[PDB]
Amino acid sequence: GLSDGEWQQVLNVWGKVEADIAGHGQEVLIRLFTGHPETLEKFDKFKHLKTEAEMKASEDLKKHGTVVLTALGGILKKKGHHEAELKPLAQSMATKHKIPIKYLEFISDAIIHVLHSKHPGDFGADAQGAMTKALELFRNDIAAKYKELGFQG
Ligand code: HEM
Ligand SMILES: O=N[O-]
């Protein structure tokens, strides 16, 4: 779990994301796709994107970044009390989309990276630590649902 102070840091940082959710969502997916091109292959609707210029130009990629960070932000605002929201998300990621838990680690690290890139000097050690714990909790809770299903990849 996260402490009260840690949750407040998380949601303080998330204010930055909410001021430009589509821009943050776009940069997160680009970082994921460029750092880990295997991840692009899980998206039939993005595997036409050969270059980062094509990614940056894709309005549908920004639209999906919005969908992703909206879902994450709603879960974050539950401050760990997210079983109802997280369970069907997890089951969809496993059974529908076949997303290995490693890709969830990749995108967690990508969120941290984009935060530093967009807010250099304004995402301090306490903020990063809090966000990291929140993303770990998210990832670990999804991992429990994956184990229930026997899902690996
Ligand atoms: C913060 C982590 C994530 C969140 C909150 C998230 C959320 C969502 C949501 C809300 C949808 C649409 C609803 C659904 O189909 O269940 C979706 C679709 C999808 N997600 Fe994710 N996702 C995450 C991470 C990932 C990762 C790491 C991958 C692959 C590497 C992935 C691949 C997909 C794909 C392929 C779809 C279907 C897209 C389409 O054709 O419309 N997601 N995600
Ligand atoms: O919640 N104060 O660590």
XYZ file of N, CA, C and O and ligand atoms in Angstrom:
658
model
N 0.820 -1.269 0.000
C 0.000 0.000 0.000
C 0.831 1.287 0.000
O 2.035 1.247 0.164
N 0.161 2.413 -0.198
C 0.769 3.736 -0.131
C 0.180 4.417 1.101
O -1.002 4.261 1.435
N 1.006 5.235 1.725
C 0.561 6.105 2.791
C -0.334 7.220 2.255
O -0.427 7.447 1.064
N -1.014 7.895 3.178
C -1.795 9.086 2.838
C -0.977 10.128 2.102
O -1.427 10.683 1.094
N 0.223 10.421 2.604
C 1.101 11.412 1.972
C 1.515 11.016 0.554
O 1.604 11.851 -0.353
N 1.800 9.736 0.397
C 2.180 9.202 -0.910
C 1.029 9.333 -1.940
O 1.253 9.784 -3.087
N -0.176 8.931 -1.533
C -1.376 9.079 -2.423
C -1.546 10.544 -2.852
O -1.863 10.836 -4.012
N -1.393 11.486 -1.898
C -1.462 12.894 -2.242
C -0.426 13.333 -3.251
O -0.724 14.169 -4.134
N 0.791 12.822 -3.121
C 1.831 13.088 -4.151
C 1.375 12.541 -5.489
O 1.491 13.211 -6.509
N 0.843 11.330 -5.472
C 0.421 10.683 -6.732
C -0.589 11.578 -7.473
O -0.496 11.811 -8.695
N -1.592 12.031 -6.739
C -2.682 12.740 -7.342
C -2.273 14.184 -7.615
O -2.840 14.833 -8.500
N -1.292 14.684 -6.893
C -0.713 15.983 -7.251
C -0.005 15.937 -8.617
O -0.279 16.758 -9.513
N 0.855 14.975 -8.792
C 1.504 14.695 -10.085
C 0.453 14.460 -11.162
O 0.566 15.018 -12.277
N -0.622 13.723 -10.863
C -1.586 13.392 -11.902
C -2.270 14.661 -12.460
O -2.763 14.627 -13.566
N -2.390 15.730 -11.645
C -2.804 17.091 -12.091
C -2.058 17.559 -13.309
O -2.656 18.121 -14.227
N -0.758 17.239 -13.386
C 0.070 17.598 -14.550
C -0.432 16.872 -15.800
O -0.614 17.485 -16.842
N -0.739 15.579 -15.632
C -1.248 14.739 -16.741
C -2.605 15.223 -17.250
O -2.843 15.370 -18.467
N -3.452 15.668 -16.328
C -4.812 16.047 -16.649
C -4.916 17.364 -17.365
O -5.892 17.601 -18.064
N -3.874 18.176 -17.244
C -3.806 19.471 -18.004
C -3.575 19.207 -19.498
O -3.857 20.095 -20.337
N -3.087 18.007 -19.843
C -2.937 17.621 -21.269
C -2.827 16.114 -21.394
O -1.750 15.488 -21.599
N -3.995 15.535 -21.249
C -4.099 14.098 -21.154
C -3.729 13.434 -22.478
O -3.040 12.432 -22.463
N -4.133 14.023 -23.588
C -3.870 13.419 -24.874
C -2.371 13.494 -25.235
O -1.850 12.555 -25.763
N -1.720 14.620 -24.959
C -0.293 14.828 -25.140
C 0.570 13.906 -24.301
O 1.492 13.218 -24.797
N 0.226 13.794 -23.034
C 0.878 12.783 -22.156
C 0.636 11.386 -22.662
O 1.576 10.602 -22.723
N -0.602 11.043 -23.023
C -0.941 9.688 -23.522
C -0.196 9.371 -24.795
O 0.351 8.271 -24.946
N -0.166 10.327 -25.729
C 0.641 10.149 -26.964
C 2.147 9.851 -26.668
O 2.763 8.907 -27.267
N 2.747 10.678 -25.791
C 4.193 10.554 -25.521
C 4.449 9.218 -24.806
O 5.496 8.605 -25.066
N 3.519 8.768 -23.933
C 3.684 7.488 -23.266
C 3.671 6.347 -24.279
O 4.501 5.427 -24.205
N 2.689 6.333 -25.166
C 2.645 5.252 -26.171
C 3.842 5.274 -27.137
O 4.299 4.245 -27.537
N 4.261 6.435 -27.594
C 5.462 6.556 -28.443
C 6.701 5.997 -27.735
O 7.487 5.237 -28.314
N 6.874 6.363 -26.481
C 8.007 5.853 -25.715
C 7.931 4.338 -25.586
O 8.938 3.625 -25.770
N 6.745 3.831 -25.321
C 6.573 2.376 -25.280
C 6.887 1.682 -26.592
O 7.692 0.692 -26.651
N 6.331 2.236 -27.670
C 6.499 1.642 -28.994
C 7.919 1.758 -29.490
O 8.354 0.910 -30.214
N 8.587 2.857 -29.214
C 9.970 3.039 -29.723
C 11.003 2.270 -28.876
O 11.961 1.657 -29.429
N 10.818 2.276 -27.553
C 11.640 1.515 -26.660
C 11.453 0.033 -26.763
O 12.380 -0.716 -26.510
N 10.259 -0.401 -27.154
C 9.887 -1.840 -27.112
C 8.971 -2.120 -28.282
O 7.749 -2.277 -28.115
N 9.553 -2.194 -29.475
C 8.689 -2.336 -30.682
C 7.772 -3.559 -30.716
O 6.862 -3.606 -31.528
N 8.110 -4.605 -29.967
C 7.215 -5.742 -29.834
C 5.823 -5.352 -29.380
O 4.857 -6.037 -29.741
N 5.730 -4.267 -28.592
C 4.497 -3.824 -28.032
C 3.600 -3.310 -29.138
O 2.413 -3.509 -29.078
N 4.184 -2.716 -30.167
C 3.392 -2.230 -31.298
C 2.643 -3.380 -31.977
O 1.514 -3.208 -32.446
N 3.218 -4.581 -31.995
C 2.572 -5.706 -32.644
C 1.275 -6.158 -31.970
O 0.485 -6.825 -32.613
N 1.053 -5.807 -30.701
C -0.236 -6.144 -30.048
C -1.384 -5.294 -30.559
O -2.522 -5.588 -30.278
N -1.071 -4.203 -31.252
C -2.094 -3.256 -31.776
C -2.195 -3.369 -33.293
O -1.466 -2.702 -33.984
N -3.148 -4.162 -33.790
C -3.483 -4.206 -35.208
C -3.681 -2.760 -35.734
O -3.067 -2.361 -36.740
N -4.415 -1.942 -34.993
C -4.634 -0.580 -35.451
C -3.456 0.419 -35.375
O -3.630 1.592 -35.769
N -2.293 0.018 -34.883
C -1.078 0.841 -34.956
C 0.084 0.192 -35.643
O 1.120 0.832 -35.789
N -0.013 -1.036 -36.097
C 1.204 -1.556 -36.770
C 1.583 -0.980 -38.157
O 2.720 -1.146 -38.591
N 0.703 -0.215 -38.790
C 1.099 0.641 -39.902
C 2.095 1.765 -39.537
O 2.590 2.421 -40.441
N 2.333 2.052 -38.251
C 3.149 3.170 -37.842
C 4.615 2.742 -37.853
O 5.113 2.172 -36.878
N 5.301 3.047 -38.959
C 6.713 2.593 -39.170
C 7.695 3.491 -38.435
O 8.641 3.017 -37.820
N 7.413 4.784 -38.448
C 8.320 5.797 -37.971
C 7.725 6.563 -36.809
O 6.488 6.625 -36.665
N 8.568 7.214 -36.024
C 7.999 8.068 -34.986
C 7.247 9.282 -35.534
O 6.270 9.739 -34.938
N 7.694 9.822 -36.666
C 6.904 10.873 -37.320
C 5.468 10.390 -37.601
O 4.486 11.120 -37.318
N 5.328 9.179 -38.116
C 3.957 8.668 -38.336
C 3.174 8.561 -37.012
O 1.993 8.857 -36.931
N 3.838 8.091 -35.976
C 3.198 8.021 -34.645
C 2.754 9.389 -34.147
O 1.658 9.541 -33.645
N 3.660 10.361 -34.228
C 3.366 11.730 -33.745
C 2.213 12.330 -34.547
O 1.428 13.116 -34.012
N 2.126 11.984 -35.836
C 1.054 12.468 -36.737
C -0.263 11.729 -36.568
O -1.282 12.157 -37.057
N -0.280 10.605 -35.868
C -1.499 9.776 -35.765
C -2.468 10.373 -34.751
O -2.231 10.342 -33.559
N -3.611 10.845 -35.209
C -4.606 11.377 -34.304
C -5.285 10.249 -33.493
O -5.722 10.474 -32.351
N -5.411 9.080 -34.102
C -5.974 7.921 -33.438
C -5.056 7.466 -32.306
O -5.546 6.981 -31.253
N -3.730 7.579 -32.506
C -2.772 7.242 -31.396
C -2.978 8.158 -30.202
O -2.955 7.727 -29.035
N -3.149 9.464 -30.440
C -3.470 10.431 -29.354
C -4.799 10.073 -28.694
O -4.936 10.137 -27.477
N -5.789 9.724 -29.519
C -7.118 9.333 -29.016
C -6.944 8.097 -28.097
O -7.425 8.078 -26.939
N -6.223 7.070 -28.543
C -6.010 5.927 -27.646
C -5.188 6.266 -26.380
O -5.423 5.751 -25.308
N -4.265 7.218 -26.469
C -3.503 7.682 -25.281
C -4.463 8.283 -24.267
O -4.348 8.058 -23.045
N -5.401 9.070 -24.763
C -6.469 9.552 -23.912
C -7.228 8.395 -23.231
O -7.556 8.491 -22.040
N -7.629 7.407 -23.999
C -8.423 6.319 -23.418
C -7.604 5.639 -22.255
O -8.124 5.427 -21.156
N -6.316 5.366 -22.528
C -5.396 4.695 -21.593
C -5.194 5.465 -20.289
O -5.442 4.918 -19.211
N -4.844 6.753 -20.391
C -4.575 7.546 -19.199
C -5.819 7.923 -18.465
O -5.756 8.029 -17.264
N -6.948 8.052 -19.171
C -8.263 8.221 -18.449
C -8.585 7.040 -17.548
O -8.997 7.206 -16.422
N -8.379 5.836 -18.062
C -8.625 4.599 -17.324
C -7.661 4.504 -16.124
O -8.099 4.338 -14.942
N -6.364 4.716 -16.376
C -5.385 4.747 -15.288
C -5.703 5.791 -14.237
O -5.617 5.499 -13.064
N -6.018 7.023 -14.638
C -6.291 8.094 -13.696
C -7.487 7.801 -12.831
O -7.482 8.059 -11.647
N -8.527 7.223 -13.395
C -9.701 6.825 -12.582
C -9.384 5.782 -11.498
O -9.847 5.875 -10.336
N -8.503 4.845 -11.853
C -8.077 3.840 -10.924
C -7.182 4.473 -9.862
O -7.306 4.150 -8.692
N -6.235 5.328 -10.283
C -5.394 6.040 -9.308
C -6.194 6.819 -8.257
O -5.833 6.847 -7.048
N -7.252 7.475 -8.687
C -8.077 8.205 -7.762
C -8.802 7.370 -6.731
O -9.293 7.921 -5.763
N -8.777 6.052 -6.876
C -9.359 5.144 -5.895
C -8.377 4.846 -4.785
O -8.771 4.251 -3.779
N -7.113 5.239 -4.956
C -6.131 5.125 -3.902
C -6.076 3.679 -3.387
O -6.104 3.453 -2.158
N -5.973 2.749 -4.328
C -5.841 1.313 -4.005
C -7.168 0.553 -3.855
O -7.176 -0.697 -3.890
N -8.290 1.277 -3.714
C -9.582 0.632 -3.533
C -10.213 0.450 -4.886
O -11.204 1.054 -5.181
N -9.588 -0.373 -5.731
C -9.916 -0.353 -7.195
C -10.316 -1.728 -7.745
O -10.317 -1.913 -8.979
N -10.677 -2.658 -6.888
C -10.951 -4.032 -7.346
C -12.001 -4.041 -8.468
O -11.841 -4.734 -9.449
N -13.097 -3.296 -8.285
C -14.172 -3.227 -9.310
C -13.709 -2.706 -10.694
O -14.056 -3.231 -11.752
N -12.879 -1.700 -10.709
C -12.374 -1.119 -11.939
C -11.269 -1.980 -12.514
O -11.155 -2.132 -13.732
N -10.405 -2.491 -11.638
C -9.204 -3.168 -12.101
C -9.454 -4.595 -12.622
O -8.816 -5.054 -13.596
N -10.364 -5.323 -12.008
C -10.597 -6.710 -12.386
C -10.993 -6.867 -13.875
O -10.345 -7.631 -14.623
N -12.023 -6.108 -14.353
C -12.328 -6.277 -15.788
C -11.281 -5.738 -16.729
O -11.101 -6.281 -17.822
N -10.566 -4.677 -16.338
C -9.419 -4.192 -17.087
C -8.365 -5.265 -17.254
O -7.962 -5.588 -18.368
N -7.942 -5.835 -16.134
C -7.039 -6.952 -16.129
C -7.463 -8.112 -16.967
O -6.672 -8.689 -17.721
N -8.711 -8.500 -16.854
C -9.170 -9.655 -17.647
C -9.194 -9.349 -19.131
O -8.908 -10.240 -19.936
N -9.530 -8.095 -19.495
C -9.479 -7.690 -20.907
C -8.037 -7.686 -21.408
O -7.745 -8.174 -22.474
N -7.110 -7.136 -20.618
C -5.714 -7.099 -21.051
C -5.200 -8.507 -21.276
O -4.489 -8.762 -22.238
N -5.600 -9.438 -20.418
C -5.138 -10.829 -20.602
C -5.836 -11.587 -21.769
O -5.160 -12.141 -22.669
N -7.174 -11.626 -21.739
C -7.932 -12.580 -22.531
C -8.223 -11.980 -23.894
O -8.215 -12.673 -24.894
N -8.447 -10.685 -23.953
C -8.752 -10.064 -25.233
C -7.512 -9.659 -25.963
O -7.349 -10.007 -27.139
N -6.637 -8.919 -25.264
C -5.462 -8.301 -25.876
C -4.181 -9.012 -25.709
O -3.214 -8.700 -26.387
N -4.134 -9.984 -24.811
C -2.953 -10.796 -24.676
C -1.695 -10.004 -24.376
O -0.633 -10.262 -24.951
N -1.792 -9.119 -23.393
C -0.678 -8.241 -22.994
C 0.137 -8.896 -21.866
O -0.367 -8.957 -20.726
N 1.358 -9.375 -22.141
C 2.149 -9.887 -20.997
C 2.408 -8.836 -19.916
O 2.551 -7.610 -20.186
N 2.548 -9.303 -18.674
C 2.745 -8.350 -17.581
C 4.024 -7.478 -17.770
O 4.108 -6.351 -17.295
N 5.022 -8.031 -18.435
C 6.245 -7.279 -18.808
C 5.901 -5.982 -19.545
O 6.542 -4.976 -19.319
N 4.890 -5.992 -20.409
C 4.503 -4.764 -21.158
C 3.935 -3.722 -20.234
O 4.155 -2.542 -20.450
N 3.230 -4.170 -19.184
C 2.785 -3.285 -18.105
C 3.949 -2.640 -17.279
O 3.859 -1.469 -16.864
N 5.029 -3.373 -17.095
C 6.219 -2.826 -16.572
C 6.816 -1.808 -17.520
O 7.159 -0.673 -17.108
N 6.892 -2.170 -18.817
C 7.370 -1.180 -19.818
C 6.568 0.143 -19.764
O 7.134 1.218 -19.808
N 5.255 0.079 -19.713
C 4.505 1.330 -19.842
C 4.573 2.118 -18.536
O 4.445 3.295 -18.610
N 4.722 1.466 -17.374
C 4.959 2.107 -16.075
C 6.224 2.950 -16.098
O 6.243 4.139 -15.822
N 7.303 2.318 -16.563
C 8.556 3.025 -16.794
C 8.396 4.146 -17.847
O 8.938 5.212 -17.692
N 7.668 3.909 -18.930
C 7.396 4.972 -19.861
C 6.660 6.203 -19.232
O 6.951 7.338 -19.592
N 5.690 5.958 -18.335
C 5.004 7.082 -17.648
C 6.004 7.906 -16.840
O 6.028 9.167 -16.919
N 6.882 7.199 -16.116
C 7.915 7.895 -15.336
C 8.794 8.727 -16.267
O 8.996 9.902 -16.044
N 9.253 8.129 -17.356
C 10.073 8.852 -18.327
C 9.406 10.111 -18.929
O 10.033 11.166 -19.028
N 8.159 10.002 -19.361
C 7.451 11.128 -19.933
C 7.237 12.245 -18.902
O 7.308 13.424 -19.253
N 6.901 11.868 -17.663
C 6.788 12.861 -16.585
C 8.081 13.703 -16.479
O 8.008 14.911 -16.467
N 9.239 13.044 -16.393
C 10.521 13.751 -16.340
C 10.749 14.571 -17.607
O 11.263 15.702 -17.538
N 10.358 14.038 -18.770
C 10.635 14.752 -20.017
C 9.810 16.034 -20.134
O 10.308 17.073 -20.564
N 8.540 15.973 -19.709
C 7.601 17.086 -19.869
C 7.719 18.048 -18.689
O 7.359 19.200 -18.826
N 8.214 17.566 -17.540
C 8.248 18.351 -16.247
C 9.634 18.245 -15.576
O 9.702 17.857 -14.406
N 10.727 18.606 -16.322
C 12.107 18.441 -15.824
C 12.315 19.361 -14.666
O 11.981 20.555 -14.747
N 12.753 18.816 -13.559
C 12.910 19.691 -12.359
C 11.660 19.911 -11.527
O 11.740 20.568 -10.498
N 10.501 19.411 -11.971
C 9.224 19.598 -11.285
C 8.630 18.231 -10.957
O 7.431 18.103 -10.663
N 9.441 17.159 -11.003
C 8.976 15.849 -10.598
C 10.071 15.247 -9.708
O 10.951 14.461 -10.182
N 9.998 15.622 -8.424
C 11.046 15.397 -7.445
C 11.097 13.980 -6.913
O 10.230 13.127 -7.261
N 12.111 13.709 -6.082
C 12.352 12.347 -5.584
C 11.101 11.773 -4.868
O 10.733 10.592 -5.085
N 10.434 12.587 -4.026
C 9.222 12.089 -3.337
C 8.081 11.805 -4.308
O 7.428 10.771 -4.200
N 7.877 12.692 -5.264
C 6.863 12.481 -6.305
C 7.111 11.208 -7.178
O 6.222 10.410 -7.454
N 8.326 11.050 -7.642
C 8.679 9.853 -8.390
C 8.497 8.588 -7.588
O 8.068 7.543 -8.145
N 8.914 8.618 -6.336
C 8.794 7.450 -5.488
C 7.339 7.090 -5.284
O 6.955 5.939 -5.437
N 6.512 8.091 -5.005
C 5.070 7.851 -4.837
C 4.392 7.295 -6.097
O 3.679 6.257 -6.038
N 4.665 7.921 -7.240
C 4.126 7.451 -8.528
C 4.602 6.007 -8.839
O 3.804 5.148 -9.230
N 5.901 5.749 -8.698
C 6.401 4.391 -8.820
C 5.656 3.367 -7.951
O 5.265 2.283 -8.479
N 5.466 3.615 -6.644
C 4.677 2.695 -5.800
C 3.259 2.512 -6.315
O 2.691 1.423 -6.179
N 2.632 3.595 -6.805
C 1.236 3.504 -7.306
C 1.183 2.631 -8.566
O 0.229 1.827 -8.750
N 2.198 2.754 -9.422
C 2.239 1.977 -10.639
C 2.577 0.539 -10.346
O 2.126 -0.366 -11.060
N 3.410 0.321 -9.336
C 3.670 -1.052 -8.888
C 2.436 -1.732 -8.328
O 2.221 -2.930 -8.596
N 1.686 -1.024 -7.520
C 0.447 -1.566 -6.940
C -0.556 -1.975 -8.055
O -1.164 -3.039 -7.981
N -0.712 -1.095 -9.031
C -1.546 -1.304 -10.210
C -1.087 -2.570 -10.916
O -1.881 -3.457 -11.119
N 0.210 -2.674 -11.183
C 0.792 -3.760 -11.898
C 0.671 -5.062 -11.087
O 0.362 -6.122 -11.606
N 0.865 -4.971 -9.790
C 0.825 -6.162 -8.973
C -0.586 -6.706 -8.839
O -0.835 -7.951 -8.825
N -1.536 -5.786 -8.721
C -2.941 -6.194 -8.638
C -3.401 -6.842 -9.949
O -4.157 -7.845 -9.932
N -2.944 -6.312 -11.071
C -3.238 -6.944 -12.397
C -2.583 -8.328 -12.424
O -3.167 -9.294 -12.902
N -1.377 -8.424 -11.857
C -0.632 -9.695 -11.864
C -1.367 -10.779 -11.125
O -1.350 -11.935 -11.589
N -2.058 -10.431 -10.045
C -2.895 -11.413 -9.309
C -4.061 -11.969 -10.190
O -4.386 -13.167 -10.210
N -4.691 -11.066 -10.930
C -5.729 -11.477 -11.862
C -5.155 -12.311 -12.982
O -5.773 -13.260 -13.434
N -3.948 -11.993 -13.433
C -3.303 -12.844 -14.446
C -3.029 -14.255 -13.923
O -3.261 -15.240 -14.650
N -2.588 -14.347 -12.671
C -2.302 -15.660 -12.117
C -3.602 -16.477 -11.974
O -3.584 -17.727 -12.213
N -4.717 -15.829 -11.569
C -5.980 -16.526 -11.499
C -6.312 -17.229 -12.835
O -6.783 -18.392 -12.842
N -6.090 -16.479 -13.917
C -6.378 -16.939 -15.277
C -5.318 -17.874 -15.857
O -5.535 -18.459 -16.923
N -4.165 -17.981 -15.212
C -3.015 -18.741 -15.764
C -2.384 -18.069 -16.958
O -1.846 -18.721 -17.841
N -2.530 -16.750 -17.041
C -2.136 -16.029 -18.256
C -0.690 -15.658 -18.158
O -0.283 -15.077 -17.172
N 0.050 -15.946 -19.218
C 1.472 -15.605 -19.301
C 1.736 -14.706 -20.540
O 2.349 -13.640 -20.433
N 1.225 -15.140 -21.682
C 1.337 -14.434 -22.961
C 0.594 -15.243 -24.048
O 0.365 -14.731 -25.165
C -1.733 1.775 -17.949
C -1.873 0.659 -18.611
C -2.999 0.382 -19.487
C -4.259 0.907 -19.450
C -4.844 1.677 -18.307
C -4.927 0.430 -20.633
C -6.250 0.700 -20.869
C -6.896 0.281 -22.024
C -8.263 0.498 -22.301
C -9.196 1.249 -21.386
C -8.560 -0.050 -23.485
C -9.911 -0.076 -24.164
C -10.856 -1.067 -23.444
C -10.507 -2.560 -23.570
O -10.347 -3.094 -24.694
O -10.382 -3.288 -22.500
C -7.360 -0.637 -23.975
C -7.275 -1.278 -25.181
C -6.105 -1.867 -25.629
N -4.936 -1.923 -24.979
Fe -4.490 -1.107 -23.262
N -4.066 -0.267 -21.411
C -2.870 -0.336 -20.775
C -1.674 -0.911 -21.229
C -1.483 -1.581 -22.422
C -0.278 -2.129 -22.905
C 1.042 -2.078 -22.141
C -0.580 -2.716 -24.170
C 0.238 -3.420 -25.255
C 1.526 -3.422 -25.315
C -1.999 -2.519 -24.372
C -2.711 -2.881 -25.509
C -4.052 -2.589 -25.790
C -4.724 -2.984 -27.057
C -4.115 -3.756 -28.189
C -5.993 -2.567 -26.969
C -7.065 -2.691 -28.029
C -6.965 -1.415 -28.894
C -7.903 -1.352 -30.106
O -7.719 -2.007 -31.187
O -8.882 -0.586 -30.050
N -2.470 -1.781 -23.343
N -6.362 -0.397 -23.056
O 1.051 10.010 5.247
N 2.063 10.509 5.688
O 3.248 9.787 5.511
